[PDB]
Structure 1
Amino acid sequence: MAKAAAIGIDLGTTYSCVGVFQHGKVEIIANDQGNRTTPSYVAFTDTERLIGDAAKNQVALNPQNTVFDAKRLIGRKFGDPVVQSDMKHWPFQVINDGDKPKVQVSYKGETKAFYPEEISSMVLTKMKEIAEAYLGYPVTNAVITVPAYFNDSQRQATKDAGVIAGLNVLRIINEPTAAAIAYGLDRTGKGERNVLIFDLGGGTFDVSILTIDDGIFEVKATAGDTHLGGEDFDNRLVNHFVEEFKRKHKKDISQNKRAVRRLRTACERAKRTLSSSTQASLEIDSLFEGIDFYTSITRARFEELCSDLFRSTLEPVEKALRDAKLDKAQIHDLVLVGGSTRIPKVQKLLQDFFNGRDLNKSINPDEAVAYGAAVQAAILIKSTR
Structure 2
Amino acid sequence: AAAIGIDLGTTYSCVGVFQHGKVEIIANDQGNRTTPSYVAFTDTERLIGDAAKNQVALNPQNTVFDAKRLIGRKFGDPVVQSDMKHWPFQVINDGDKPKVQVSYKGETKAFYPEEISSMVLTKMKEIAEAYLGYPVTNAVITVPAAFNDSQRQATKDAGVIAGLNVLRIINEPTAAAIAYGLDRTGKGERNVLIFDLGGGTFDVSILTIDDGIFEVKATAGDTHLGGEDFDNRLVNHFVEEFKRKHKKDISQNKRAVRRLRTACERAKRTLSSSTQASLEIDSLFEGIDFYTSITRARFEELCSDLFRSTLEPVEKALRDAKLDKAQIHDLVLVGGSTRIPKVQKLLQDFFNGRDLNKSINPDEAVAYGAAVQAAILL
Q: TM over 0.5, yes or no?
A: yes
Distance 1:21 1:314 in 2: 34
Shift of 1:75: 1.0
CA contact (8 A) 2:16 2:23 kept: yes
- SS of the counterpart of 1:366? helix
- SS of the counterpart of 1:265? helix
- RMSD value, Cα: 1.1
Residues 112-140 of structure 1: per-residue CA shift (max 9 Å, x gap): 11111111111111111111111111011
- SS of the counterpart of 1:367? helix
Distance 1:285 1:106 in 2: 30
Shift of 1:190: 2.6
User: Which residue of 2 is the match for residue 222 of structure 1?
Assistant: 219
Residues 182-236 of structure 1: per-residue CA shift (max 9 Å, x gap): 0111113331111100100111111111111011111111111111010111110
- SS of the counterpart of 1:185? coil
Distance 1:260 1:238 in 2: 7
Distance 1:64 1:22 in 2: 41
Shift of 1:292: 2.9
Distance 2:300 2:6 in 1: 33
Shift of 1:155: 0.7
2:71 pairs with one of 66, 70, 74: 74
| Higher deviation after alignment, 160-169 or 254-263 | 254-263
- SS of the counterpart of 1:376? helix
Distance 1:199 1:36 in 2: 18
Shift of 1:255: 2.1
Shift of 1:341: 0.3
- SS of the counterpart of 2:362? coil
Residues 74-124 of structure 1: per-residue CA shift (max 9 Å, x gap): 111111100000011111111111111111111101111111111111111
Shift of 1:249: 2.3
Distance 2:38 2:120 in 1: 7
Q: Does 1:324 align with 2:321?
A: yes
Shift of 1:252: 1.3
Q: 5+ residue gaps in structure 2?
A: none
Distance 1:248 1:65 in 2: 34
Residues 317-349 of structure 1: per-residue CA shift (max 9 Å, x gap): 111111111111111110001110011110011
Distance 2:46 2:199 in 1: 24
Q: Judging changes above 3 Å, is the alpha-carbon distance between structure 1 residues 97 and 285 closer, same or farther for their aligned structure 2 residues?
A: closer
CA contact (8 A) 2:129 2:135 kept: yes
Distance 2:359 2:281 in 1: 34
| Higher deviation after alignment, 279-288 or 71-80 | 279-288
CA contact (8 A) 2:185 2:210 kept: no
Distance 1:61 1:292 in 2: 19
Residues 24-71 of structure 1: per-residue CA shift (max 9 Å, x gap): 111111111111111111111100111111111111111111111110
User: Which residue of 2 is the match for residue 254 of structure 1?
Assistant: 251
Distance 1:284 1:54 in 2: 19
Shift of 1:14: 0.5
User: Which residue of 1 is the match for residue 346 of structure 2?
Assistant: 349
Residues 118-169 of structure 1: per-residue CA shift (max 9 Å, x gap): 1111111111111111111101110000001111111111111111111100
Distance 1:184 1:303 in 2: 33
Residues 246-300 of structure 1: per-residue CA shift (max 9 Å, x gap): 1222221212223222221111111111111111121223333343322211111
Distance 1:342 1:83 in 2: 30
Map of 1:26-37 to 2, 5 A cutoff? 26-37=23-34
Distance 1:211 1:352 in 2: 23
Q: What is the percentage of aligned positions where both structures have the same residue? A: 99
Shift of 1:15: 0.6
- SS of the counterpart of 2:300? helix
User: Which residue of 1 is the match for residue 168 of structure 2?
Assistant: 171
Distance 1:104 1:291 in 2: 35
Distance 1:46 1:186 in 2: 49
Distance 2:71 2:286 in 1: 42
Distance 1:285 1:160 in 2: 43
- SS of the counterpart of 1:8? strand
Question: Structure 2-normalised TM-score?
Answer: 0.98
Distance 1:205 1:34 in 2: 27
CA contact (8 A) 2:57 2:259 kept: no
